[PDB]
Amino acid sequence: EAPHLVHVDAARALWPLRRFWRSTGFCPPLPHSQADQYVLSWDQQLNLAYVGAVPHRGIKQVRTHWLLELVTTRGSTGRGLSYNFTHLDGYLDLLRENQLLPGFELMGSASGHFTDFEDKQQVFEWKDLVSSLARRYIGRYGLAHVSKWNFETWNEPDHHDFDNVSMTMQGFLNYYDACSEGLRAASPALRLGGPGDSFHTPPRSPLSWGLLRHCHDGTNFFTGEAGVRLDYISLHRKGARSSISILEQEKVVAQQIRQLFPKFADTPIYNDEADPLVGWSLPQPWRADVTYAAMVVKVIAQHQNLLLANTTSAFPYALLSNDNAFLSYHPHPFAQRTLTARFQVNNTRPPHVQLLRKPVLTAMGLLALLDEEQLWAEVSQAGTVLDSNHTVGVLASAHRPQGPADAWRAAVLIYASDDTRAHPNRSVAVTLRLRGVPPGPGLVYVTRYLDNGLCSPDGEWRRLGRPVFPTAEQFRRMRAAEDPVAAAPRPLPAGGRLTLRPALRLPSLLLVHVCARPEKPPGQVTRLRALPLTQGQLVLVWSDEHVGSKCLWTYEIQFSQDGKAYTPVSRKPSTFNLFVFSPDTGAVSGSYRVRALDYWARPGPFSDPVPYLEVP
Ligand SMILES: *[C@@H]1O[C@H](CO)[C@@H](O[C@@H]2O[C@H](CO)[C@@H](O[C@@H]3O[C@H](CO[C@H]4O[C@H](CO[C@H]5O[C@H](CO)[C@@H](O)[C@H](O)[C@@H]5O[C@H]5O[C@H](CO)[C@@H](O)[C@H](O)[C@@H]5O)[C@@H](O)[C@H](O[C@H]5O[C@H](CO)[C@@H](O)[C@H](O)[C@@H]5O[C@H]5O[C@H](CO)[C@@H](O)[C@H](O)[C@@H]5O)[C@@H]4O)[C@@H](O)[C@H](O[C@H]4O[C@H](CO)[C@@H](O)[C@H](O)[C@@H]4O[C@H]4O[C@H](CO)[C@@H](O)[C@H](O)[C@@H]4O)[C@@H]3O)[C@H](O)[C@H]2NC(C)=O)[C@H](O)[C@H]1NC(C)=O
Numbered sequence: 343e344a345p346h347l348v349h350v351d352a353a354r355a356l357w358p359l360r361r362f363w364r365s366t367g368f369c370p371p372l373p374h375s376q377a378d379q380y381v382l383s384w385d386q387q388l389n390l391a392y393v394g395a396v397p398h399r400g401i402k403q404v405r406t407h408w409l410l411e412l413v414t415t416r417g418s419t420g421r422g423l424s425y426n427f428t429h430l431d432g433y434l435d436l437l438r439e440n441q442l443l444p445g446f447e448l449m450g451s452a453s454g455h456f457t458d459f460e461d462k463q464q465v466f467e468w469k470d471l472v473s474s475l476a477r478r479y480i481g482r483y484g485l486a487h488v489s490k491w492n493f494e495t496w497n498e499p500d501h502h503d504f505d506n507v508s509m510t511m512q513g514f515l516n517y518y519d520a521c522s523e524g525l526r527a528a529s530p531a532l533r534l535g536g537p538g539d540s541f542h543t544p545p546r547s548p549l550s551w552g553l554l555r556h557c558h559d560g561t562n563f564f565t566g567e568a569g570v571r572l573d574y575i576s577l578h579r580k581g582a583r584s585s586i587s588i589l590e591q592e593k594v595v596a597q598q599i600r601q602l603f604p605k606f607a608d609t610p611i612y613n614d615e616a617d618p619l620v621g622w623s624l625p626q627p628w629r630a631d632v633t634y635a636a637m638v639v640k641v642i643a644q645h646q647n648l649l650l651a652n653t654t655s656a657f658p659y660a661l662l663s664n665d666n667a668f669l670s671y672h673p674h675p676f677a678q679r680t681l682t683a684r685f686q687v688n689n690t691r692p693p694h695v696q697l698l699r700k701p702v703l704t705a706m707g708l709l710a711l712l713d714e715e716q717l718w719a720e721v722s723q724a725g726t727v728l729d730s731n732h733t734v735g736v737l738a739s740a741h742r743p744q745g746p747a748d749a750w751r752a753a754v755l756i757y758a759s760d761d762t763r764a765h766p767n768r769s770v771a772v773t774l775r776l777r778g779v780p781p782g783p784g785l786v787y788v789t790r791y792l793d794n795g796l797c798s799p800d801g802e803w804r805r806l807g808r809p810v811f812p813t814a815e816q817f818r819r820m821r822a823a824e825d826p827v828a829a830a831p832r833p834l835p836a837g838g839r840l841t842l843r844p845a846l847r848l849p850s851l852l853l854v855h856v857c858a859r860p861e862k863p864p865g866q867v868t869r870l871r872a873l874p875l876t877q878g879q880l881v882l883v884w885s886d887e888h889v890g891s892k893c894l895w896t897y898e899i900q901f902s903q904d905g906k907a908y909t910p911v912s913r914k915p916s917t918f919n920l921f922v923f924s925p926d927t928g929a930v931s932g933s934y935r936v937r938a939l940d941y942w943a944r945p946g947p948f949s950d951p952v953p954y955l956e957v958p
Pocket residue numbers: 368369370371372373621622623671672673686687688810
């Protein structure tokens with residue numbers, strides 16, 4: 343078989359490249375009124391630390407169901423009604439602590455107070471609850487912050503998961519007007535969209551189409567004004583194992599909306615559950631490893647190249663979210679649709695929890711390296727040009743430099759993916775010809791590579807015999823496979839051109855990073871935290887907000903016990919903003935500090951030191 347040729351032209355920055363995929367989401371389990379226990383548990387604290395640690399704000403939003411089950415009430419409609427926001431504060435603070443935003447679905451019953459969206463008193467109360475919420479979080483976080491949040495309707499109104507709430511077609515419309523007026527009363531600057539459903543062919547999905555008809559033509563329950571604002575339209579379409587099918591289904595719904603509701607011609611569209619396959623909890627081997635990670639990249643490449651890049655349609659697609667922040671269950675720690683693999687290690691005194699970063703999470707780190715301009719690229723095989731609707735594709739970006747702490751970069755991400763199918767004995771020959779690299783000081787390139795043989799913690803877990811309660815040693819062995827294989831910085835050839843011939847597996851991901859040397863070294867690591875795991879172990883997590891350049895080789899972690907000299911912690915190169923520290927001696931009490939190391943072996947300054955004393 344002829345090699346796949348991938349040509350990238352760094353002299354042709356074509357149009358902006360938006361990072362429209364920086365979202366995840368989850369649903370707490372039953373009973374929903376106990377969402378607080380799932381959402382504020384140590385598991386979730388760890389889980390969100392991992393979501394937030396993807397570098398360069400690679401994941402921004404966490405679309406969370408049943409947020410309003412986190413609010414309780416005192417009194418009643420008649421004698422005076424009060425809200426207790428404590429558990430909601432807890433969860434929202436937890437997101438903020440990890441630099442994440444909620445996908446704020448206005449979903450739940452405030453501990454069973456709201457039962458009927460056609461009851462006029464209830465609709466008026468809802469409006470005030472929504473204003474109270476917004477005003478509260480505007481005061482707690484600032485208007486600039488909260489006005490970044492995608493407030494959204496109840497999830498999947500056409501799927502009837504309303505617990506004991508009666509939400510008719512009319513009810514849903516009243517509920518919507520209360521949301522819209524509730525938020526508007528707090529501030530006209532806040533964003534609301536919906537309905538978050540399939541938009542199946544009419545007469546199906548009637549609440550969804552209903553909502554659009556209501557906002558476009560109906561009358562506001564409170565003001566009586568014609569038309570109600572709708573800032574974005576969110577749909578769900580999953581691929582039933584096909585990547586390109588997600589896009590095909592989207593184009594069909596977008597077309598129907600464009601024709602039926604002209605006022606909505608420019609209204610941004612979200613697919614905020616854009617998963618390969620419906621049913622997060624169904625174990626699938628491909629969800630465990632690079633198969634799913636490469637498919638996630640493939641789906642994003644298809645959106646960028648076949649939808650956003652230009653088109654006849656040029657339809658206003660703004661967000662894609664893989665709904666994958668759920669926590670996994672025994673006996674399927676790795677094979678559920680989750681960013682992390684959860685191990686409830688019950689045999690320690692006391693029981694504890696460990697998470698492993700799955701390849702899909704790691705791949706979000708690769709997408710995070712993409713910069714703000716798209717470069718011209720073209721994939722071909724035997725002289726035939728292949729668009730991203732094929733097993734091999736590419737996404738290539740460039741960065742226009744600003745300060746002395748910055749310089750030109752190109753990021754080239756290549757995927758080899760047959761959707762949900764792995765091909766363990768296939769090898770795909772690729773010839774990458776990058777040309778038109780502008781001249782610049784100290785031009786180097788670094789490669790990062792993911793496949794199932796080298797970077798699958800699931801694979802390592804199976805090689806160890808799938809231990810249900812892995813040992814500390816066995817966890818170390820599993821984690822050694824979390825990061826891509828990194829190759830040390832190499833100078834670019836003379837002349838402006840780079841050509842590589844990597845052999846890709848199916849699936850695999852390859853990121854080729856080309857950087858010119860910024861004048862100044864990296865910035866400081868901030869917000870370092872040390873969180874207990876169990877006797878002998880902790881997780882370090884930090885922020886890269888002030889680090890500056892994306893041309894990072896690793897973070898150097900240093901440890902000092904007894905005021906004694908700081909000593910580097912030996913480990914794989916990694917740009918992930920979190921590390922599980924589990925030394926063989928078990929010695930973890932002391933101080934820690936972390937700094938960025940760039941592609942030219944320059945350090946940024948150390949974080950403030952962080953004391954840690956193990957409670958015995
Ligand atoms: C170390 O210690 C750990 C504790 O610290 C131990 O941890 C425990 O491990 C167990 C695994 O061994 C876990 O048990 C398993 O739990 C899961 C999840 O349970 C929860 O979620 C369920 C699903 O909720 C979704 O769906 C509903 C709608 O149906 C929604 O309302 C939810 O919002 C949610 O929706 C999202 O997700 C779905 C996908 O599921 C999406 O489709 C949606 O769109 C959303 O995104 C939920 O149903 C469960 O609710 C039950 O339990 C509640 C109390 O916890 C209770 O209040 C509820 O009424 C309900 O109770 C009934 O059922 C349970 C049994 O589940 C009974 O005990 C109880 O008496 C009631 O009858 C819950 O909220 C769960 O799915 C698993 O169940 C499957 O497998 C077992 C067999 O193992 C069967 O019992 C089940 O019927 C079910 O069947 C599977 O297989 C069937 C055929 O085989 C087939 O029908 C399916 O294929 C199906 O998969 C397990 O029960 C336990 O959760 C976990 N504990 C904790 C705290 O984490 C750990 O085990 C230990 N380690 C070791 C090694 O010992």
